[PDB]
Design a protein around this motif. Structure first.
Motif, PDB file in Angstrom:
ATOM      1  N   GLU A  95      46.098  39.756  37.720  1.00 49.42           N
ATOM      2  CA  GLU A  95      47.329  40.221  38.359  1.00 49.42           C
ATOM      3  C   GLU A  95      48.035  41.165  37.396  1.00 49.42           C
ATOM      4  O   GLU A  95      48.807  42.037  37.807  1.00 49.42           O
ATOM      5  CB  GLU A  95      48.257  39.049  38.703  1.00 49.42           C
ATOM      6  CG  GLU A  95      47.802  38.220  39.893  1.00 49.42           C
ATOM      7  CD  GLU A  95      48.816  37.164  40.287  1.00 49.42           C
ATOM      8  OE1 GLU A  95      48.558  36.423  41.263  1.00 49.42           O
ATOM      9  OE2 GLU A  95      49.871  37.081  39.618  1.00 49.42           O
ATOM     10  N   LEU A  96      47.778  40.969  36.107  1.00 48.51           N
ATOM     11  CA  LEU A  96      48.360  41.820  35.086  1.00 48.51           C
ATOM     12  C   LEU A  96      47.665  43.166  35.204  1.00 48.51           C
ATOM     13  O   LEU A  96      48.308  44.210  35.217  1.00 48.51           O
ATOM     14  CB  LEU A  96      48.124  41.237  33.696  1.00 48.51           C
ATOM     15  CG  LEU A  96      48.601  42.124  32.551  1.00 48.51           C
ATOM     16  CD1 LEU A  96      50.084  42.406  32.723  1.00 48.51           C
ATOM     17  CD2 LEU A  96      48.331  41.438  31.219  1.00 48.51           C
ATOM     18  N   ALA A  97      46.342  43.128  35.306  1.00 47.24           N
ATOM     19  CA  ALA A  97      45.563  44.343  35.435  1.00 47.24           C
ATOM     20  C   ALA A  97      45.986  45.082  36.704  1.00 47.24           C
ATOM     21  O   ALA A  97      46.077  46.309  36.709  1.00 47.24           O
ATOM     22  CB  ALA A  97      44.086  44.007  35.484  1.00 47.24           C
ATOM     23  N   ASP A  98      46.249  44.338  37.778  1.00 45.89           N
ATOM     24  CA  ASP A  98      46.671  44.956  39.030  1.00 45.89           C
ATOM     25  C   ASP A  98      47.999  45.675  38.851  1.00 45.89           C
ATOM     26  O   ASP A  98      48.198  46.763  39.382  1.00 45.89           O
ATOM     27  CB  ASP A  98      46.819  43.918  40.146  1.00 45.89           C
ATOM     28  CG  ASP A  98      45.489  43.433  40.676  1.00 45.89           C
ATOM     29  OD1 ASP A  98      44.485  44.166  40.568  1.00 45.89           O
ATOM     30  OD2 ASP A  98      45.455  42.317  41.225  1.00 45.89           O
ATOM     31  N   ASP A  99      48.914  45.053  38.116  1.00 50.76           N
ATOM     32  CA  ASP A  99      50.221  45.648  37.871  1.00 50.76           C
ATOM     33  C   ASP A  99      50.079  46.920  37.048  1.00 50.76           C
ATOM     34  O   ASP A  99      50.757  47.911  37.305  1.00 50.76           O
ATOM     35  CB  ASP A  99      51.130  44.673  37.122  1.00 50.76           C
ATOM     36  CG  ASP A  99      51.713  43.604  38.022  1.00 50.76           C
ATOM     37  OD1 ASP A  99      52.368  42.680  37.495  1.00 50.76           O
ATOM     38  OD2 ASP A  99      51.521  43.691  39.253  1.00 50.76           O
ATOM     39  N   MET A 100      49.195  46.883  36.058  1.00 47.08           N
ATOM     40  CA  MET A 100      48.979  48.027  35.190  1.00 47.08           C
ATOM     41  C   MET A 100      48.319  49.205  35.882  1.00 47.08           C
ATOM     42  O   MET A 100      48.586  50.351  35.534  1.00 47.08           O
ATOM     43  CB  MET A 100      48.146  47.617  33.980  1.00 47.08           C
ATOM     44  CG  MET A 100      48.886  46.704  33.022  1.00 47.08           C
ATOM     45  SD  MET A 100      47.919  46.381  31.552  1.00 47.08           S
ATOM     46  CE  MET A 100      46.694  45.367  32.242  1.00 47.08           C
ATOM     47  N   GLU A 101      47.463  48.936  36.860  1.00 46.22           N
ATOM     48  CA  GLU A 101      46.787  50.015  37.572  1.00 46.22           C
ATOM     49  C   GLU A 101      47.774  50.937  38.293  1.00 46.22           C
ATOM     50  O   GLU A 101      47.522  52.133  38.440  1.00 46.22           O
ATOM     51  CB  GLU A 101      45.802  49.451  38.588  1.00 46.22           C
ATOM     52  CG  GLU A 101      44.729  50.432  39.002  1.00 46.22           C
ATOM     53  CD  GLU A 101      43.777  49.857  40.033  1.00 46.22           C
ATOM     54  OE1 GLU A 101      42.666  50.408  40.190  1.00 46.22           O
ATOM     55  OE2 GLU A 101      44.144  48.855  40.688  1.00 46.22           O
ATOM     56  N   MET A 157      37.232  58.401  38.297  1.00 40.82           N
ATOM     57  CA  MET A 157      38.526  58.452  37.628  1.00 40.82           C
ATOM     58  C   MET A 157      39.191  57.097  37.898  1.00 40.82           C
ATOM     59  O   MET A 157      39.692  56.436  36.984  1.00 40.82           O
ATOM     60  CB  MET A 157      39.344  59.598  38.235  1.00 40.82           C
ATOM     61  CG  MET A 157      40.454  60.164  37.384  1.00 40.82           C
ATOM     62  SD  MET A 157      39.954  60.849  35.778  1.00 40.82           S
ATOM     63  CE  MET A 157      41.191  60.098  34.812  1.00 40.82           C
ATOM     64  N   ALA A 158      39.165  56.674  39.158  1.00 39.52           N
ATOM     65  CA  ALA A 158      39.749  55.392  39.540  1.00 39.52           C
ATOM     66  C   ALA A 158      38.994  54.244  38.877  1.00 39.52           C
ATOM     67  O   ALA A 158      39.590  53.226  38.518  1.00 39.52           O
ATOM     68  CB  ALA A 158      39.718  55.229  41.046  1.00 39.52           C
ATOM     69  N   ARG A 193      40.593  51.599  36.152  1.00 38.97           N
ATOM     70  CA  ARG A 193      40.536  50.165  36.417  1.00 38.97           C
ATOM     71  C   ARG A 193      39.998  49.451  35.178  1.00 38.97           C
ATOM     72  O   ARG A 193      40.557  48.444  34.732  1.00 38.97           O
ATOM     73  CB  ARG A 193      39.635  49.874  37.628  1.00 38.97           C
ATOM     74  CG  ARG A 193      39.595  48.398  38.019  1.00 38.97           C
ATOM     75  CD  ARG A 193      40.970  47.889  38.445  1.00 38.97           C
ATOM     76  NE  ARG A 193      41.015  46.433  38.394  1.00 38.97           N
ATOM     77  CZ  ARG A 193      41.992  45.686  38.905  1.00 38.97           C
ATOM     78  NH1 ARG A 193      43.024  46.260  39.520  1.00 38.97           N
ATOM     79  NH2 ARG A 193      41.936  44.362  38.795  1.00 38.97           N
ATOM     80  N   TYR A 194      38.916  49.979  34.616  1.00 45.16           N
ATOM     81  CA  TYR A 194      38.338  49.382  33.428  1.00 45.16           C
ATOM     82  C   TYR A 194      39.364  49.353  32.299  1.00 45.16           C
ATOM     83  O   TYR A 194      39.469  48.359  31.571  1.00 45.16           O
ATOM     84  CB  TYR A 194      37.108  50.161  32.975  1.00 45.16           C
ATOM     85  CG  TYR A 194      36.717  49.833  31.559  1.00 45.16           C
ATOM     86  CD1 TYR A 194      36.124  48.610  31.239  1.00 45.16           C
ATOM     87  CD2 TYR A 194      36.997  50.718  30.524  1.00 45.16           C
ATOM     88  CE1 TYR A 194      35.818  48.278  29.908  1.00 45.16           C
ATOM     89  CE2 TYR A 194      36.700  50.400  29.198  1.00 45.16           C
ATOM     90  CZ  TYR A 194      36.113  49.181  28.894  1.00 45.16           C
ATOM     91  OH  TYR A 194      35.831  48.871  27.581  1.00 45.16           O
TER      92      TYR A 194
END
Lengths: 89, 85
Positions: free
Chosen positions: B18-24, B64-65, B69-70
């Motif tokens: 969810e952290l990664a989702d927020d950062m994206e 790019m996307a 994400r990575y």
């Protein structure tokens, strides 16, 4: 004739790639990783990423730095491709 | 394995994702384009070539996307670790 044209097409194809690869080498120097680290510093913190997490990935994590250098290359090769097309138009 | 540890692990994985989702959402592609426009025009990259890549090149946009994400998943991964502190 049909062998002389496949040859001409080959030569032109090869010269185009060389032009591209050389163009991609110039542009690559235009985007060093620290710009991407700054980007993350400027934008990921407000989302929960500490400066330390970013610093760990960019200054310490080895693969991340490699997968990062690899994407930069892909980006520049790609923009090089379109730059060439443009010259050819 | 205790239930406490199992859930802890599980929860940590969701938080990280969810952290990664927020950062994206904190790094849209137009920021990368600006970056290119600010540093490549000087190395032979025209505004049009950058635009073509960012607006017309489907694969470019997708890869790019993918990289973005990575980037956030990796940074999220390290942040969770740091949260262990």
């Amino acid at each position: 004739r049909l062998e002389a044209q496949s040859w001409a097409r080959h030569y032109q194809q090869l010269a185009r790639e060389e032009k591209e690869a050389e163009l991609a080498d110039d542009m690559e120097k235009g985007i060093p990783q620290h710009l991407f680290e700054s980007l993350c510093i400027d934008h990921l913190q407000r989302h929960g990423a500490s400066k330390k997490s970013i610093t760990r990935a960019f200054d310490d994590d080895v693969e991340f730095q490699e997968r990062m250098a690899e994407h930069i290359r892909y980006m520049v090769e790609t923009i090089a491709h379109h730059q060439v097309d443009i010259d050819s138009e």
